[PDB]
Structures are given as C-alpha cells and as structure tokens.
Design a protein around this ligand. Structure first.
Ligand SMILES: NC(=O)c1ccc[n+]([C@@H]2O[C@H](COP(=O)([O-])OP(=O)(O)OC[C@H]3O[C@@H](n4cnc5c(N)ncnc54)[C@H](O)[C@@H]3O)[C@@H](O)[C@H]2O)c1
Ligand SMILES: NC(=O)c1ccc[n+]([C@@H]2O[C@H](COP(=O)([O-])OP(=O)(O)OC[C@H]3O[C@@H](n4cnc5c(N)ncnc54)[C@H](O)[C@@H]3O)[C@@H](O)[C@H]2O)c1
Ligand SMILES: CC(=O)N[C@H]1[C@@H](OP(=O)(O)OP(=O)(O)OC[C@H]2O[C@@H](n3ccc(=O)[nH]c3=O)[C@H](O)[C@@H]2O)O[C@H](CO)[C@@H](O)[C@@H]1O
Ligand SMILES: CC(=O)N[C@H]1[C@@H](OP(=O)(O)OP(=O)(O)OC[C@H]2O[C@@H](n3ccc(=O)[nH]c3=O)[C@H](O)[C@@H]2O)O[C@H](CO)[C@@H](O)[C@@H]1O
Ligand SMILES: [Cl-]
Ligand SMILES: [Cl-]
Ligand SMILES: [Cl-]
Ligand SMILES: [Cl-]
Ligand SMILES: [Mg+2]
Lengths: 347, 345
C-alpha cells in the first residue's frame, strides 16, 4: 500500500515505466513539469492518459517541478512512498555544452533537493536514471560497470556523473540508504500497442526518431553524422535497447531495493552494437519503405562505438533485454505510423 | 562596477582577505550566515569588527545565506559588483564523510545559485576557494596544476573538484566569464596584529590550532596521526602557507580577472613542506612552551606528503608567499596567546 514516486514520469522512458509499474501491481504517483512532455486535453499528460487507458488503471499525477521545494515537501508529506524512481531532468538536445548552469541547476541541484526531501521524509530507496555517457570516450569495449567514469565531454554527462558520485557517498555514509543507479544505453522502440512512444518536439537530435520521421515521409533524408569512424562501416555504433525492456529493468530495480542492497550500479543495455547504417536498414525492413540518407560532417563529441557488458544486470538484477532489433524497429514504426505527428489531444 | 562581493567573509581566510582588500583600496561587501563565525556585540561578526578597527575602514556587511535566492537577488540589486570572491561553504570538521547532503547542499547548490545570480546580473568575474585536496593522493611531488584532479577523498574534496569542473564548463560556454580558481594548500598563521585568526569551535580537526591549543594549555597533548609514513621523519608533511600571503594572493587574482583571462587555475602554497614534528618544534620555539605529543594510528585517508609547485602562480599571477615558518608560528602564537578563547564566549 505504499506508493512509488515517479519523477519526470510523463516523458519517454518514464511513461513506459509507469505502464510497467501499473501492470506489475505497483501504485505510482507521478510528477512532471511538462518541460519535455505534451499536455493532454485534461489534467494528465497525453502519454499518461493513454497509459491509463492501456492498463485500465488510474494514474495519480501532479504537475510539479522538482525544483519547487514547497510542492515537493507537501507531496512527500501527503504520501507514504516506499521508493522514488527519478527520471526528471534535462537531457541534451545537443544543448548542454552551451547552457551548463541549466544542467547543473535542473539535474544537480534538483536531485540534491530531492535527496534532501527524501531523507527528511524517511524515504531512502531510490532508482536513478543514469547513462552510458558517464563512461566518457570508451577506453575499451564492451563497457562494464568497472570501466572508468567521469572522464569526458559535456555538462549533461558531467551532471550524471556528479549525481552518481553524490549518491555513492550518501550510501557510504548511511547504510540505511538503498539506491540503484541505472546506466541506460540507447533507448528505442515503443510500447507494442503503438499508442505511446518517443515524442520529440521539433527536429529530433537522436537517430531513431529522425529515421522514423524519414520513413513516415516527414523528412526527406537522414543526415548521417560521419562515416569515417573506426568501425566496420565507418558509422557510429551503439547499443540500442527497447524502451519496454528498459522500463522493466526499473521493476527489477525496485525488487533489488527490497533486498536492502545499499548502493548498486547496473548497465541497462543489450550488449549488441548496431551501426547507423544497420539501423537504417532495419527501419527499411520494418517500415517497408526506402530510407534515404546523406553523409555529413561528424557531430562534435560523438564517440565511434559504445555498447554494454550486460552481465552484471543479468546476474544481480535478474534482468535481461528480451527484445531484439526487429522488435524495436517494428514497435517504433507502429507508434510512428499510427501517430504521424506524435501525441495530440483527444478529438 | 566598483564593489567586490566577499562570500563567507567573516571566516578565517575571508576575514584576512577583507582586511587585505581594504588596505589595497578595494570596496568589499561581505556576506555570511554565521554558520562558522562568531557574532560580536553589533551588526558585524567579531572578526570583521576587528578588521574595521585595524584598518580604520568601514566594512559593509549583510547577514545572509548563499542558499537564499531572494536575498541574493536583493543583494545584487542593491550593489553594483565588479567581482565576487567566494569563500562561503562547509569545511570538514572531519564531517564530510558522514554528512554528504549538507556539503552538497551548501557547497554545490550554494555555489550554483551564486553563479546563476552572477550570470543574471552580468557579474562574470569570480575568485574561487579551491584546495589542494582536488589532486587526490599525490602521484608526484611537488604538485603542479597539471597533476591529475578528481578521485578526491571525500564529499568535501569531491565538492571542490565538482565546483572547479562546473566553473570550467561555464567559462567554456561563455567566453565573457573570467574565473580564478585558487587551490589553497594548508593555511596557517594570523594577521600580525594578533587580533584576528582562526577561531575553531570544539576540538580542532587541523594540526596547527590543535598544536597552539596544547601550547596554551587547553589540550594535554598532541595526537600524532602515525609516524610510519615514507617521509623523512615518518610523520605527515604539508605545505603550510601563511593566511596573510594567501589573502594577498586573492588580490593578485582580482588583478588577473582584469586581464580578461577566462578560466585560470593556480596553486596557493609556499613550495616548502614541513612535517608534524617540525611544526611542533617550531611552535615550541615560537611560544616558549612545551608541546607534549603522542604517536597514534594513522588517520583514515591521510596522505603521507603534500606540497605545492608554486611556479605557475609566481609566473602568471605574479604572486609568491613571503612569510616563512618562524613568522607563521610567531603569528599563530600571538593570536592564540592574546586570545585564549578565540573571539568570544
Ligand atoms: N533517452 C535517452 O537516450 C537517455 C539516455 C540516458 C539516460 N537518460 C535519462 O533518463 C531520464 C529520462 O529520459 P527520457 O528519454 O525519458 O527524457 P524525457 O525528456 O522524455 O523525460 C524526462 C521528463 O522529465 C520532465 N522534467 C524535466 N525537468 C523537470 C523538472 N525540473 N521537474 C519535473 N519534471 C521535469 C520532462 O518534462 C520529461 O517528461 C532522464 O534523466 C535522462 O537524462 C535518457
Ligand atoms: N582552511 C583550510 O584549510 C581550507 C583549505 C582549502 C580550501 N579552503 C576553503 O576556503 C574557504 C574559506 O575557508 P575558511 O578556513 O576561512 O573557513 P571558515 O569556515 O572560517 O569560513 C567560511 C565562512 O563561510 C560562512 N558560510 C558557511 N556556509 C554559508 C552559507 N550557506 N552562506 C553564507 N555564509 C556561509 C561561514 O559562516 C564562515 O564564516 C572555504 O570554501 C574552504 O572550504 C579552506
Ligand atoms: C541524449 C544523449 O545522451 N545524447 C548523447 C549521446 O548520443 P548518442 O550518440 O548515443 O545517440 P544519438 O541517437 O544522438 O546518435 C546515435 C548514432 O546515430 C548518429 N546520428 C544521430 C542522429 C542523426 O540525425 N544522425 C546520425 O548520424 C550519431 O552520430 C550516433 O553515432 O551520446 C553522444 C556521444 O557522447 C552525445 O554527443 C549525445 O549528446
Ligand atoms: C586528508 C585531509 O587532507 N583531511 C583534511 C585536512 O587536510 P590535512 O591532512 O592536510 O591537514 P590537517 O591540518 O588535518 O593535518 C596536517 C597534518 O597533521 C597531522 N595531524 C593533524 C591533526 C592532529 O591532531 N594531528 C596530526 O598528526 C595530519 O596527519 C597531517 O599529516 O584539513 C583540510 C583543510 O585544512 C581538509 O580540506 C581535509 O579534508
Ligand atoms: Cl486527463
Ligand atoms: Cl574513430
Ligand atoms: Cl559592529
Ligand atoms: Cl546527509
Ligand atoms: Mg560480468
């Protein structure tokens, strides 16, 4: 009967996670400030309104910013949370390098504040959205949890690293805390219903949505960011993981917290890397459409190849990414086709 | 466009720096929340009251917390600053390891809030209190600015490294910013007057104050944290730097900002390391008192030796520490002796 607080729950990964939580018998309380989520016709974000329909279960939601101390305090006072799943934050839209203070404020001070409010309310169980970016430029592959962290590039990645570090210390100082830090790889795909998915605003900065937008006919050609990398085909290689598998990894994380695990860190990836061209091809196959593209200049700070060593998670978390490349592509296409312009308010 | 904001200016290093600022003709505006500063009988913290008396110049002060956005806004509206010297923060009262959230809140959130207001008001000139702790366990000695940083011992040291990194990012993103990050070594000593100095509450965590307290008779004996290190005498070696020189280093930092230097990093040390025993001996000489000691276990996480490579600071900032060991000890003793209970009770 104790709830699970889900911050940033109206977004891509959060919405899918709320759905999994609901199906698994959990009772979420979701908060979001609409920074990167579409408002529905009603009080609920559209994504969550659809989750409610898909599951036939009610979504408890509050529009709120994690930076709003008073609101957050009242929330923790009103409910008895048994854990918090923290998705809220800014991600880079290639932005971070240019607005460091926004990233430091939203991600860093926002999480510090959340942790303080959690502590004060006796809630010491956390699931944190981390990223493979913390590893910086891979020194070796695949990337296991022991790979060095904090070496590279941007304010976004740094913010994630500083957060992990802070949580590690917190756990070190107080053994009563339990925290699972999940380093996601490259989330893709969508719920199999095709009703919810990634809903980018404007020109997508990430690969897959751009690809699907081309396939759907909204964009003429994919711009491939360099083809001279030291990879098989010259294009960047990444570990794409189905958002549904990723969402389920959060449920596994909650179970881990119940073991009084202390601080634990796990990669959430498939362990299989695919190049840009490979993804294009898979999308042609899923969509049944030809996907044009043009090779352009490299994108500043792009790594050649990145992919996970998923063993720890399989072993300790009791989780594995069950969905393959075709599934990811087919699910992405379904969402895209059924919702040519992303989320919209009900007719 | 004229004033210099000094956060945590009522503290040990900050009060000495305010004094130096005044003497050099700057107009400081100080803020402090009294978290680690003693309140006098008036508005001003005792330390600042004294500085005012010593310099014969007025000290503009506002009691406030850097964590208070509203207060920051009001402050920046009231005064026109040309630069900010940021001393405010929590130091380890050996505490950091145990209370991460307090450190992260005050040091990280507090500094971010400050940088935001600075940015908002177009005051893009900062001098930051960093520390040699950012270098972590020395890989080589002396420590130059090029030595690796990060991988800090504690939540406190981590906090310092995180802040340097955020500032670096800020300067990268906006070429208009100028920031001088000062990595202090081991500050000691006191103003020659003997009127102000470090005023620790409770059992001091740092060597020097502990030593002075044993000399004055407040403590029975000094506990020496190990004598089996790979140092000449087996005891820990550090680069003790006179707080007056350190304060002057901040003035040199202000002048550096004027050059539109972007982000610059400098060690503030003497380049000379002394062992625990050498400090004890020097203090016995300075005080004329005996300082009994007992060798105990190594303190968790202590480094064997740490000292600075002062070349870059001399070359680029045009600054060098002028006061040596005897002077440090003489000044520290004067303060302790003339003020057996610090600033008050
Ligand atoms: N998508 C990826 O490839 C990826 C990779 C690694 C890690 N992550 C991390 O996972 C999390 C979720 O990513 P996502 O793809 O779902 O992004 P998203 O932008 O769709 O989801 C984040 C949600 O947080 C909300 N939010 C932002 N600032 C907020 C604030 N101050 N208060 C409350 N809510 C706020 C946004 O409105 C949004 O709905 C983020 O922390 C992200 O950094 C994502
Ligand atoms: N003394 C050292 O050995 C040492 C070593 C290296 C770096 N540093 C750093 O130099 C700075 C000054 O150190 P110090 O020895 O003078 O310490 P100090 O404690 O005497 O000075 C810090 C001052 O900041 C004030 N303060 C704390 N939190 C505040 C807040 N939220 N808002 C406003 N004021 C606040 C305190 O009341 C105090 O007067 C600190 O950032 C410290 O971490 C000191
Ligand atoms: C949200 C996030 O964390 N993004 C980061 C992630 O991107 P990351 O590279 O992992 O993910 P993307 O989806 O942006 O790119 C995937 C691959 O497709 C390529 N591609 C993408 C889009 C496009 O229009 N054309 C194209 O060719 C990219 O070059 C890359 O090789 O790590 C990168 C490398 O550190 C960072 O620079 C990004 O800021
Ligand atoms: C590992 C470490 O750096 N810890 C802190 C200490 O550093 P740091 O160790 O440099 O400075 P200290 O003043 O605490 O100790 C200096 C030397 O004296 C020894 N000593 C100290 C006190 C005592 O009672 N007996 C004794 O023998 C120590 O082992 C060390 O060799 O103070 C700093 C501020 O000045 C903090 O930023 C550091 O978090
Ligand atoms: Cl609704
Ligand atoms: Cl390469
Ligand atoms: Cl007064
Ligand atoms: Cl804490
Ligand atoms: Mg393994």
């Amino acid at each position: 009967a104790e709830k699970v607080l889900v911050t940033g729950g109206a977004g891509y990964i959060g919405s899918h996670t709320v759905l999994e939580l609901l199906e698994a018998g959990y009772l979420p309380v979701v908060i979001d400030n609409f920074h990167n989520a579409f408002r529905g016709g009603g009080s609920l974000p559209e994504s969550l309104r659809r989750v409610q329909e898909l599951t036939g279960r009610s979504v408890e939601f509050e529009e709120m910013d994690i930076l709003d101390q008073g609101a957050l305090q009242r929330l923790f006072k009103k409910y008895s949370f048994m854990a918090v799943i923290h998705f809220a934050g800014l991600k880079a839209m290639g932005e971070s390098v240019q607005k460091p203070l926004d990233y430091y404020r939203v991600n860093l001070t926002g999480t510090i504040q959340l942790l303080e409010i959690m502590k004060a309310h006796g809630v010491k169980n956390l699931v944190f959205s981390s990223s493979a970016t913390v590893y910086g430029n891979p020194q070796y592959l695949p990337l296991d949890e022991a790979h060095p962290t904090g070496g590279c590039t941007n304010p976004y990645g740094k913010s994630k690293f500083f957060i992990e570090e802070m949580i590690r210390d917190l756990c070190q100082a107080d053994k009563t805390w339990n925290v699972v830090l999940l380093r996601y790889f490259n989330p893709t795909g969508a719920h199999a219903s095709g009703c919810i998915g990634e809903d980018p605003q404007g020109i997508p900065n990430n690969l897959m949505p751009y690809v699907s937008q081309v396939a759907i006919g909204r964009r003429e050609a994919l711009n491939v960011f360099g083809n001279d990398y030291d990879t098989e085909d010259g294009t960047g290689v990444r570990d794409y993981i189905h958002v549904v598998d990723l969402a389920k990894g959060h449920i596994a994380a909650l179970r881990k917290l119940k073991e009084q695990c202390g601080c634990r860190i796990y990669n959430l990836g498939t362990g299989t890397g695919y190049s840009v061209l490979q993804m294009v091809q898979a999308m042609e196959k899923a969509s049944g459409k030809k996907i044009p593209y043009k090779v352009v200049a490299r994108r500043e700070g792009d790594v050649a190849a990145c992919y996970a060593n998923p063993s720890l998670a399989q072993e300790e978390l009791g989780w594995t990414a069950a969905l393959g490349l075709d599934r990811m592509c087919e699910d992405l296409w379904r969402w895209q086709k059924q919702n040519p312009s992303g989320f919209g308010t009900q007719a």
